Amino acid sequence: SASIRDAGVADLPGILAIYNDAVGNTTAIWNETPVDLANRQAWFDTRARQGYPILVASDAAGEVLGYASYGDWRPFEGFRGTVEHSVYVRDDQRGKGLGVQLLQALIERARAQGLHVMVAAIESGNAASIGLHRRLGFEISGQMPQVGQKFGRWLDLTFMQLNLDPTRSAP
Amino acid sequence: SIRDAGVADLPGILAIYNDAVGNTTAIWNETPVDLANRQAWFDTRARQGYPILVASDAAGEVLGYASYGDWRPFEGFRGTVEHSVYVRDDQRGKGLGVQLLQALIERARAQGLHVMVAAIESGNAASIGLHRRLGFEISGQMPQVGQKFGRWLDLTFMQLNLDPTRSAP
Structure with a gap:
């Protein structure tokens, strides 16, 4: 049902809610401190400067069900072919294949951009995420x-x- | 002699850094930097509370240097640092690598860190062996x-x- 599309600034509150839920409840993000809308706007601007995509899985009402992006992996020019991605699915939307849809879409973007390697960093106990990537x-x-x-x-x-x-x- | 780097050591550090940029796979940058670039790097490390150490003689000429910094930019990685060690090309095979890394390890311990990470170009057998x-x-x-x-x-x-x-x- 859900569609995958590029994020806009109006998706940032939904993105923020997913980000802060993972911060509070999971090992998907190794920060314990929640962030504000301004912080995610700064992140959005960073991706814009880099020319890197942010995608959302969205429903009819424009609810953000999940999102995905990639950025630089290591801060040296020799690593310009390599990006590190992240994919987040809203907790209630798990088990619906949305993570796959998001990551498939992100891979296609990375290819269209002439990138060479995508890197995932996954907490080792997260078998669901490891299997999705495999x-x-x-x-x-x-x-x-x-x-x-x-x-x-x-x-x-x-x-x-x-x-x-x-x-x-x-x- | 292994000691903390001072501002006076930056020209010596610059020369080694640029040597490595030009001639090695130790830094995956191909463009040489100016002194101001290393000055900013030095100030950032100082402000972060991370060490920059120099292998030096009593006269003060820089034979090698070593530092560590953040590995990944998340609070969850605060126990983990990534180091670098560079020895001047004419000073290889003199135990300076071991000396500098040992000193950096001691500093990391004193700072209560948990893990030190090295990123090494895979064909660099000497550096892999040094670390082992x-x-x-x-x-x-x-x-x-x-x-x-x-x-x-x-x-x-x-x-x-x-x-x-x-x-x-």
Whole structure:
């Protein structure tokens, strides 16, 4: 039912609500402090400057059911072919394949932009997220113990990556 | 002698940094920087409370340097830093690498950090071995994530847990 489209500034309150819910309730984002609309507007502006997409999964009423974006992975010019993405689905919208729809769409954008590699950073216990990525062609590249903390406990990080143009032998 | 870097060390640090930009896969930047660029980098580290150390003689000439900073820009990663160590090209095979990394590790410990991460171009067998010698373990292997000299480069992550008896943050 839901459609995937580019985000506008009017989607930012719905984006913020999803972001802050993950902050409060999950390991999907390793921050414990919630942010305000201005912070997400600054994030939106950053993506605009970079020319990177922000996509939303939306319903008829314009409710944000999920969103996805990518940014730079490491801050050096040698990494310009590589981006790190994030995909968030509203908690009540889980189990409907929206994460797949969002990530499929984001991959197609990344390809159209001539990018080389998409990197996912996933908390290692999040089997749902790992499986979603695996089924879209991502491979495990790293497993990094105790690099994070949240809820008073150490967290491990799994890196997965997708090469978007495996035939491109040279940059 | 290993000591904290001062402003006087920046020309020595600049020369080493630019050498690495031009001649190595140690920095995945291909464009040389000016002194002002390193001055800003120095000030940012100072303001963050992160160390910049220099391998120096009593006269003060910079034989190598080392620093660490944020690995990922989220509060959840506050126990984790990413380091770099650079030794002047004419000073290789003299134990300066071990010296600097050992000193950086001691500083990270004193600051109560939990994990130090190295990002190493995968073909750099010497640097991978140096890190293994100081108890780093491979924790990531990432094909073609970067480029330099007109070719794709692979990246190896290695990490050291600074306090593995600390069951909780």
